[PDB]
């Protein structure tokens, strides 16, 4: 699903403000053509046989 709420890592109540003990769970990849193998983006498809 989609969830953009702010993580509460510590035992401190916070809302809206991001920073210490208020983390954003969504972080992005970075892809450049000069990266090595292992940092290359690999397209993955699976199957759901039953």
């Amino acid at each position: 699903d989609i969830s953009t709420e702010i993580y509460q890592a510590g035992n401190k109540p916070c809302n809206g403000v991001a920073g210490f003990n208020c983390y954003f769970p969504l972080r992005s990849y970075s892809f450049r053509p000069t990266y090595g193998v292992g940092h290359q983006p690999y397209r993955v498809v699976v199957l759901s046989f039953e």
Partner: antibody
Amino acid sequence: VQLVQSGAEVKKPGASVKVSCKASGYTFSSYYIHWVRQAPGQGPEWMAIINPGDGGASYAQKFQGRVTLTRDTSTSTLYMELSSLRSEDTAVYYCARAEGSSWLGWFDPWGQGTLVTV
Amino acid sequence: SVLTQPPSASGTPGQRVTISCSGSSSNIGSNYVYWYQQLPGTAPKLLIYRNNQRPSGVPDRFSGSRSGTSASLAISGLRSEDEADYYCAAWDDGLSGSGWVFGGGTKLT
């Protein structure tokens, strides 16, 4: 429809050396720019690939972070500022042109190069 | 990987020899190769595309091909003007870096 370099000379090791070449000719936003270094008596090593407009940059393993490049559109200048010069950093630089919106394919003609020695 | 090249290429005026670049897996057999010739005192110049056609126009006395993990270029009708250095360029896609790697160095005699 051509590229010419800039003049330079010998500099002290462990300093910053400014290198640049102009760019003119066709449209600018849809042609990637290659720079490549060549050492005398050996084979050349690939330096950088640059996307104009947003100024996208990418660097090789042996030069990641130790070299800095800047680019612009209206003035059409392409700068590197070399730092941490060794005796290995005495070579000739070339600025190039690519296919456009693609970093794979043949290389368009280079300039006259810039020689740097320590 | 490293793209080993012979140190020199012997020849006499008026005959055919082959100059080759031997590479590792996923460097020559994966992507295409590029042949380059460096005339002394001049900027280098492109001579071939992917080895099935000529870029703008050259007489067909030079022929390029691939074999497994290596690339070869057969040259004929050798002249004293064409004595230069030959280079090969390829996309490496190796571990920790995937730059435009080049070959070693050869001299035409």
